[PDB]
Design a protein around this ligand. Structure first.
Ligand SMILES: [Mg+2]
Ligand SMILES: [Mg+2]
Ligand SMILES: [Mg+2]
Ligand SMILES: [Mg+2]
Length: 127
RNA sequence: GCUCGCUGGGGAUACUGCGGGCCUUGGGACCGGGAGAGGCCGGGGGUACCCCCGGGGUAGGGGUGAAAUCCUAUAAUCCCGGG
């Protein structure tokens, strides 16, 4: 038939993580981050690092029989920033280029209905 | 003229004071259909977050203007099932 999986993309201002699981999520097919493809901390969240990691993960997934994925992309969320970093969309485009079919795309950033207090004080970072 | 102050009497009744009568306009009481994150007490929920147990997977995660302390093979970051 068609073996379909899920691509979980975690994108912040400091790094990017691309993690492919099966359709239920309980089994890990492949997992690559920005620090595994570059040597400098400054380049970890760049679009090019996201492309490289997505390509490695997609190749490992294709060798094992995955044909397509559905995509779940998230920023850190909670009491941290709600906006994804610059690597998410580059990672999305690279998966399709490497040979995977793409299903539905959704954002799953966790959002509180008035949760906890964030760091920094009532004055924030002072730079 | 000044010591603008005191005292014996006579007259007036507009205003203020005091006594009696009569009002409803200010204020208060009550009745009707509605408005509101006003207050107190009891019950039922919402996501988010932290810790613990079990499954997967394996070398990094976190963080800055740039780094380091810190966390991680006693298996982290990430994903799934529960408390
Ligand atoms: Mg790193
Ligand atoms: Mg501090
Ligand atoms: Mg300064
Ligand atoms: Mg485990």
């Amino acid at each position: 038939k068609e073996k379909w999986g899920i691509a979980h993309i975690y994108s912040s201002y400091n790094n990017t993580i691309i993690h492919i699981t099966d359709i239920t999520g309980a089994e890990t097919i492949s997992r690559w981050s920005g620090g595994m493809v570059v040597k400098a901390d400054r380049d970890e969240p760049s679009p090019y690092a996201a492309m490289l990691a997505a390509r490695r993960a997609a190749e490992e997934a294709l060798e094992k029989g995955i044909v397509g994925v559905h995509i779940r992309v998230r920023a850190p969320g909670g009491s941290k920033s709600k906006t994804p970093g610059p690597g998410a969309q580059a990672a999305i485009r690279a998966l399709a280029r490497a040979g995977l079919k793409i299903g539905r795309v959704e954002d799953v950033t966790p959002i509180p209905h008035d949760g906890t207090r964030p760091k920094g004080g009532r004055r924030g970072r002072r730079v």
